């Protein structure tokens, strides 16, 4: 019980496909491109996360002022509550002061 | 990434194999055998 009786289907991986064979290309676009472009501009994803790093409270604060006017009402309400909970935890709870 | 223990079966068999010769439920139930295997050692 809790463990499968048969072996799973093999996990076949193509190590020489397009995405793996051309990974890392143009990462030094700045050094070798006379600094016309910056590597962070090659990052794709949420517009509030491109070329930026932070903790959950920092990520949530950044999302609310960058795309908060476009968020769904229910999702925005949960975001504000998440920021309230994290504000109390980080600034009032913990082992160190 | 959600990780789960996949080999919990072998973790308890290396304890119960030392309880096979005990009497009662402490030879097949980990919760009970683990406390009696440790007293035996």
């Amino acid at each position: 019980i809790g463990i499968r009786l048969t072996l799973p289907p093999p996990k076949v991986v193509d190590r020489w496909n397009e995405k793996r064979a051309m990974f890392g290309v143009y990462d030094n676009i700045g050094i070798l491109g006379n600094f016309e472009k910056h590597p962070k501009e090659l990052i794709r994803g949420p517009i509030w996360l491109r070329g930026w790093k932070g903790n959950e409270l920092q990520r949530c604060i950044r999302k609310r002022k960058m795309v908060g006017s476009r968020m769904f009402a229910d999702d925005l309400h949960n975001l504000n509550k998440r920021i309230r909970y994290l504000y109390k935890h980080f600034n009032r709870h913990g082992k160190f002061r | 990434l959600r990780n789960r223990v996949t080999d919990r079966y072998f973790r308890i068999q290396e304890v119960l194999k030392h309880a096979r010769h005990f009497r009662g439920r402490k030879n097949r139930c980990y919760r009970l055998a683990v406390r009696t295997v440790i007293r035996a050692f």
Binding site: I3, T6, P8 | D7
Partner: peptide, 26 residues
């Protein structure tokens, strides 16, 4: 179903051993 291959492979080996004991070969 849990993802992984190491535990399933290791469990197949114990099943073979159990089968040999129940049915030892000539």
């Amino acid at each position: 179903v849990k993802k992984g291959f190491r535990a399933a492979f290791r469990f197949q080996k114990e099943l073979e051993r159990q089968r040999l004991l129940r049915c030892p070969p000539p």
